Symmetry: C6
Subunit: 218 residues, 6 copies
């Protein structure tokens, strides 16, 4: 990663490596893995990101899907950023291609140069953006449940049902507005009869805290 | 987080991440989780706070309640701090909205800029204030006992009864004066007959040390 | 905590937090907990000390007693240091009250200012002094044995008896002179007959090493 | 390893040593060991690399093969870089031989000098290149399966079959084009009848995500 | 502890504290504890040394003996270094007493001042010298065996017998010359008949390596 | 150890101490212990090396042999470097004896002075050289097998036999040329009949990779 205020490079630490490896080993592709990854890769160069992706043993279907997503995003970057032929002048650096951002055709020194230039070319955060895109696609693909099937059991406490509902919702492919519709439409509709009656008695503008308080004793 | 004396940024450490994750995994929403959180987020940017909140897997009902609380506080901030339309001048930065403080519509560089400006705009400690508000609401909502039900058993040592009393009291929703009333009224009233007689013999102005010393042999 | 030689602030580390929490979890209020606390809080601000006290879950009777002790010491500080009304001038800081030293009515910046001023106002070491006072009161209150009841068994090796004696003595409420009297009077008196005869044969000015050597084979 | 921006030397850390040793102990010569090694040796001198190779106990057949590969690459370097006889002048350093790059005939100071000179002679990354070459040869030699034998079982979920396929493919000796041919030819051909029919119905240009989605319910 | 080259103070780390505590918990007063202590206290102030001694729970007989030894050494220091009455001048510091070196009557700032002055008054290494003296007395007092009782068994391999011999010898109270006599006299004398015959056949000037090689097959 | 580029001293870390202690506890005197030691002592002063040697509990026969080896090397250093009588001048330091290099008659400051002088007198790397000499003698003395007894079993896979062969060879006392002879003469000679026939069919100049590939299916 890159850290008076001058940005200087630093190698990836054993604690970071082991933390990432253990996270993948234990939690597979649960949603919370994506922020953890993003937490362990703050300020990372494309070389560091490739290091974290390549140290994963197993799950090679998901890693291959991630490669294909990264290749798509790189091809799009090349389509939007055509390269200009010509010799690079002193005081400048070559403009990066898709494969340079993905760390396969650029050196560590070139990545440091792009990331420390003024103005900065943040290849690390771009590559990280692509990687998180692919990881999201994997997380949704490996989710075992659908939000339309989350229904409160006859004896199920309301809190547990809401936990299942919002976990599944966190795994879903939907914009924020579609998720607001799922909350405002499905949550009360799929509650059990007693809880459903009480929640309908609350009103259309009830907060989650008010709903869980209403069905608390139930 | 942000640390000659110049404030410089630093990424969140694997030890911090793992510590927070394990705390949530082991202690759920016991009261002591709130200071621990506040301890692990000293000097954190809104991005770091969002990182710690998003790495929590499960408990998604509580995390959703936390989102709603944060949205309420952000809406209030917008009501009290209306934005002024106009182009930002050199040497200045845009004034933050509620969503900028919550880290969803502001970049890392903007947060660093607000937090390092003179005078400082401490978006991290404001967002942290909102988060701790919501966490308190969760802690009270998930408390299994009420202070009016804590009664000393016939053979229960006075120390254990006081432990239960002040744990439950720590989970309660009450100002400091209401808590002083609960201490001065309920503690002796709900003791067992022998201890209650002795404590009544102490007097109205007895310290906790004197009360536990009086009922020690009992 | 606060660390060319200029004192600069630093957040509390996860290793410190976890170390303190585990110490309290494992050893309750054994004597050796007090130096450990003092070791984990070197250079701590009142905010750090409050962090370490508040992260303790359970033992809330002892924590409440600690609060009452801290309030007493703060009230005494206010009685000895009356505040002077008037506007604070540039180049100065307000003089702290008892609640400012205890970290409940002062900010982090004010504590840093007091602790880095020339001459220094060491609010952290003062608050720490109060806290260690209360912790001592707790340690003595929770000690299960009295020094007058430590008596050597008929087959007990002298070393084990001395271990019990000086552990209990370490838990006792007594000045150093009272402890010298307890050593010079009770240790030999409460030994078993054979050891007692030998130690009486040593003389009044025998060192502990000489006494344990004399009763070694016994 | 070597780290205002001036490159300064630093000893290898116990966390790095232990991490590498445990990786070799647990995962033998699985593919993901090679990036991990490369991650634990960022900025390493030839002395550090020799340290990591020599701390491996057991697997001495593979370590001997690695020695032979390194000797071959060193001999090639000597063939391409003949040494010029003559006294080294002040302000210069001797040009390295193959054994100097491999760390057996050069001192720590000479390696630091080559790696910090302007222009730099990166003996560490060259030696690391040779080492990774030999490690790849070992990984392929110890792979238990061939890509032509990976066939989907009659009840096997498509995801597991793809996992096996791309793990074995990761262990294979083949350029990227040969691997694209293996993907485009063998993956669908060796699927089970139902999945094979569906994938043939997809078309020749199907992405891996589309293929796993098509055979998901199957 | 105290660490451009200017000596600056630093608090004691949780890893140091835990390491020392675990060492005492696991190995009691085996000889190797003394260097470990000395390793964990490099550059320590008397406050740090008192911290490490006071965090030991149990073994209070040995800790009391250590207190008595420290008091003896302090009294001797006072006898050899009489204090001169008079007001301390600007640019000077008071000369330390025995109790100042032992950290009971001096502050942290005074210890830092003595240890950083030119010329330096190394109170930390002096106090450490006293502490190691007392620790040696404890180690010898708690040793269960005597060197005159270490005799090779009839079937005992020579290596194990030498291990026992030199462990016991390491616990002994003897100067280096007395230990050379114990080696040159007792080691061969107390070997078993066969080994003893062979070693006598070696000669008076045999090295330990030659002796263990001679009795290796035996 | 000793680390703008100026060499400054630093105390030995708890992670280094614990790593070394655990290595000795778990692996005794296997060959790979020697590089590990050398890895944990990069830049160490003679005081640090003596610290690592003295913290070893048990194996006191081997530690005594190490003392005798160190004494021999020190005596040789004294024979080759006679001391010159005379008062040391300002701007100079006394030239070290054998016991000064071994850290028994020199202080920490003198070692720092020798190791930081220009030109440097590297007492740490010299002492380390002696220590590694003695450690090698111990490793060879405690090896349970001889290279002339390593013979492939009738059903033994060739890889396992080569592992045993090169482990035992790593423990052997032989120069590199003697080891090349052992490889070129004994490895094929002591293989089982089938493998031996195939390897003889390879030819005299076969690489280890070619030999293990030839006998792979066998
Ligand atoms: Cl995995
Ligand atoms: Cl998953
Ligand atoms: Cl890879
Ligand atoms: Cl850009
Ligand atoms: Cl961009
Ligand atoms: Cl479901
Ligand atoms: Cl509920
Ligand atoms: Cl959780
Ligand atoms: Cl909870
Ligand atoms: Cl998220
Ligand atoms: Cl503000
Ligand atoms: Cl504000
Ligand atoms: Cl209850
Ligand atoms: Cl009680
Ligand atoms: Cl606790
Ligand atoms: Cl207790
Ligand atoms: Cl609190
Ligand atoms: Cl003051
Ligand atoms: Cl004061
Ligand atoms: Cl008792
Ligand atoms: Cl005894
Ligand atoms: Cl291994
Ligand atoms: Cl393998
Ligand atoms: Cl080696
Ligand atoms: Cl080159
Ligand atoms: Cl090159
Ligand atoms: Cl297979
Ligand atoms: Cl599937
Ligand atoms: Cl202990
Ligand atoms: Cl012991
Ligand atoms: Cl104490
Ligand atoms: Cl002195
Ligand atoms: Cl002195
Ligand atoms: Cl014995
Ligand atoms: Cl033997
Ligand atoms: Cl050991
Ligand atoms: Cl061994
Ligand atoms: Cl020693
Ligand atoms: Cl020299
Ligand atoms: Cl030399
Ligand atoms: Cl054998
Ligand atoms: Cl084989």
């Amino acid at each position: 990663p890159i850290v008076q205020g001058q940005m200087v490079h630093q190698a990836i630490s054993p604690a970071t490596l082991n933390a990432w490896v253990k996270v993948v080993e234990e939690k597979a592709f649960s949603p919370e893995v994506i922020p953890m990854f993003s937490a362990l890769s703050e300020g990372a160069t494309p070389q560091d990101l490739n290091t974290m992706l390549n140290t994963v043993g197993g799950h090679q279907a998901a890693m291959q899907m991630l490669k294909e997503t990264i290749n798509e995003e790189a091809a799009e970057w090349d389509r939007l950023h055509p390269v200009h032929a010509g010799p690079i002048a002193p005081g400048q650096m070559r403009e990066p291609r898709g494969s340079d951002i993905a760390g396969t055709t650029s050196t560590l020194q070139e990545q440091i140069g792009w990331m420390t230039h003024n103005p900065p070319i943040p290849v690390g955060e771009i590559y990280k953006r692509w990687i998180i895109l692919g990881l999201n696609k994997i997380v949704r693909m490996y989710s075992p449940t659908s939000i339309l099937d989350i229904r409160q059991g006859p004896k199920e406490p309301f809190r547990d049902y809401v936990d299942r509902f919002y976990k599944t919702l966190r795994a879903e492919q939907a914009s924020q507005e579609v998720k607001n519709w799922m909350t405002e439409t499905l949550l009360v509709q799929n509650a059990n009869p007693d809880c459903k009656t009480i929640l309908k008695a609350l009103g259309p503008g009830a907060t989650l805290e008010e709903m869980m308080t209403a069905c608390q004793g139930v």
